[PDB]
């Protein structure tokens, strides 16, 4: 049921970079 893909990575890296 849990879904992991490339977009979860990029949003994680974005969140880190911007904060």
């Amino acid at each position, epitope marked *: 049921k849990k879904k992991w893909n490339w*977009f979860d990575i990029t949003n994680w890296l974005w969140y880190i970079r911007k904060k």
Partner: antibody
Amino acid sequence: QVQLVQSGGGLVKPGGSLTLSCSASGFFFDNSWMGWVRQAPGKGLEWVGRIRRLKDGATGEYGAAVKDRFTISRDDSRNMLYLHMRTLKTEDSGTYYCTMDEGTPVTRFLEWGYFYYYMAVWGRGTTVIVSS
Amino acid sequence: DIVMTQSPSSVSASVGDRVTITCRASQNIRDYLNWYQHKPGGSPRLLIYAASTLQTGVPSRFSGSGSGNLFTLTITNLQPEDFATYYCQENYNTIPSLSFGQGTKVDIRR
């Protein structure tokens, strides 16, 4: 392997509506971005639009030539991708492919948050002819 | 927003030759570029993403290079199954345009 079967399309007069469908199997449909690409007779490929996962909001993004006229939707319970086409014009005729899209994260720190994006698996295509 | 211009629009080659297709972007798009293969009455096929990363299952005959606004697809030792039309595609805009080049058709030389 990934299998995509398309249905719908056909003949419609200009100004009419039409819905294309794409049923998927062989991969985790719910965890995939999907889209559509078209080719007019005697012309090259043209991106139509894409849709994100439901957990991403199921946001539809569209090419400029079809924006405000076409909408994409998905039914995860049936592994169905749809392209809703209204106010059709003759220049909308052509072969429409549904695509399974994929991304790859950019790792350069200055570009964290961005991704390469590409159409990884293409359907066989469905013909649409807008004519009176 | 972004226009992709491929050249040549057509080229004739024989089996075993080196064919080079060029793609020019109307602005700097870094390495956000795809290459596709398309045969008549067939479905388009992804060859390369990120300008130079080969998709799994693609013969090493295909290689992509370039960055900024000038890109190339090279096919070494052309094979019979490589006669087809080839498209580049930008994936640079955050608000996607995903523009394709007009396509290059690779014909048989005689």
